[PDB]
């Protein structure tokens, strides 16, 4: 998160910190959010050979009783995810066991309605990602308020599409999500409407988020079958 504030500790109890293992490199990191006691939603590009989820964290360098380090048994990447266009950048992780409900750990379930969210309003995103182009990931959970933009604002991303994705962040400000924040939720009036996907390498906003409403049928299909 660039240009944000430190979250009040444990104030976003659905937030998940992902450590991703691959065969031929060191650990990589993403965000995510708990939508059922045994399911975390995140980005498809955060997939790997294996993943560990930490719930209940604020400062990710300091072990505490709120932590739950949970095993992932299976990864469900969207079947149409495309590594060139980055369309359909969404994935569900099934946990080996159901998480414990505490003050610091709880689900963010979707409401019944899945209305298409138009441009104009302010939304909030949180993560442990880089705080600048040349700065490491944050030790503490950070968050920032961003403007939902008209789709033409993201035209320079040649594979952006308005039906699939949200365009997020006023170009006149530095405020943005960045590397390490991918997979985290964008909340508009307390309701998850987007998932951090990608942006420019120089972190100039706006950035591109997966539009959750488009994928509600697919999410439901996976949850009901597993």
Ligand X SMILES: CC(C)c1c([C@@H](C2=C(O)[C@@H](C(C)C)NC2=O)c2ccccc2)[nH]c2ccc(F)cc12
Q: Which residues pair with 70 in a beta bridge?
A: 53
* Smallest separation (angstroms) from ligand X to the CB of 102: 28
| Residue 108, contacted partner among ligand X, Zn ion, none, CB below 5-8 A by kind | none
* 113 belongs to the binding site for ligand X (CB under 6 A): no
CA distances from 181 to 177, 198, 212 (A): 6, 9, 17
* 44 belongs to the binding site for ligand X (CB under 6 A): no
**46 and 81 Cβ atoms separated by less than 8 Å:** no
Non-local CB neighbours of 42 within 8 Å, separated by 6+ positions: 16, 18, 30, 31, 32, 33, 90, 91, 92, 93, 182, 183, 195
* Smallest separation (angstroms) from ligand X to the CB of 127: 9
* 162 belongs to the binding site for ligand X (CB under 6 A): no
CA distances from 140 to 72, 128, 137 (A): 23, 6, 9
Please report, as residue ranges, which positions from 172 to 201 form the binding site for ligand X (by CB under 6 A): 176-179, 181-182, 196, 198-199, 201
Catalytic residue check, 159: no
* 30 belongs to the binding site for ligand X (CB under 6 A): yes
| Residue 178, contacted partner among Zn ion, ligand X, none, CB below 5-8 A by kind | ligand X
Please report, as residue ranges, which positions from 37 to 76 form the binding site for Zn ion (by CB under 5 A): 64, 66
Q: Which of 88, 89, 138, 176 is catalytic?
A: 89
Strands 135-137 and 130-132: antiparallel
Only one of the segments 25-33, 49-57, 107-115, 139-147 lies at the binding site for ligand X (rule: CB under 6 A); that segment is: 25-33
Non-local CB neighbours of 175 within 8 Å, separated by 6+ positions: 2, 3, 4, 144, 145, 146, 169, 205
Catalytic residue check, 182: yes
* Smallest separation (angstroms) from Zn ion to the CB of 101: 16
Catalytic residue check, 89: yes
Report d(CA 164, CA 38) in Å as an integer.
Answer: 26
Q: Give whichever of 56 and 199 is closer to ligand X, judged by the CB atom.
A: 199
* 4 belongs to the binding site for ligand X (CB under 6 A): no
* 45 belongs to the binding site for ligand X (CB under 6 A): yes
**193 and 123 Cβ atoms separated by less than 8 Å:** yes
**48 and 28 Cβ atoms separated by less than 8 Å:** yes
Report residue 34 as tokens: 């708990």
Q: Which residues are catalytic?
A: 45, 89, 182
Interface residues toward Zn ion, by CB under 5 A: 64, 66
Write out the residues near ligand X by the rule CB under 6 A: 28-30, 45-46, 86, 176-179, 181-182, 196, 198-199, 201, 207
């Amino acid at each position: 998160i660039i240009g944000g504030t430190e979250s009040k500790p444990h104030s976003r109890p659905y937030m998940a910190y992902l450590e991703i293992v691959t065969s031929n490199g060191p650990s990589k990191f993403c965000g995510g959010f708990l939508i059922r006691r045994n399911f975390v939603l995140t980005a498809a590009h955060c997939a790997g050979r294996s993943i560990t989820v930490t719930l209940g964290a604020h400062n990710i360098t300091e072990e505490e009783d709120t932590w739950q380090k949970l095993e992932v048994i299976k990864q469900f990447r969207h079947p149409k995810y495309n590594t060139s266009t980055l369309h359909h950048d969404i994935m569900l992780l099934k946990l080996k066991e159901k998480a414990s409900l505490t003050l610091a750990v709880g689900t963010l379930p979707f409401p019944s309605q899945k209305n298409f969210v138009p441009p104009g309003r302010m939304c909030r995103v949180a993560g442990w990602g880089r705080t600048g182009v040349l700065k490491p990931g944050s030790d503490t959970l950070q968050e920032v308020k961003l403007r939902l933009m008209d789709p033409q604002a993201c035209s320079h991303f040649r594979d952006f599409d308005h039906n699939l994705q949200l365009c997020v962040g006023n170009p006149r400000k530095t405020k943005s999500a960045f590397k390490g924040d991918s997979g985290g939720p964008l909340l508009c009036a307390g309701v998850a409407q987007g998932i951090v996907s990608y942006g420019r390498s120089d972190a100039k906003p706006p950035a591109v988020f997966t539009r959750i409403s488009h994928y509600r049928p697919w999410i439901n299909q996976i949850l009901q079958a597993n």
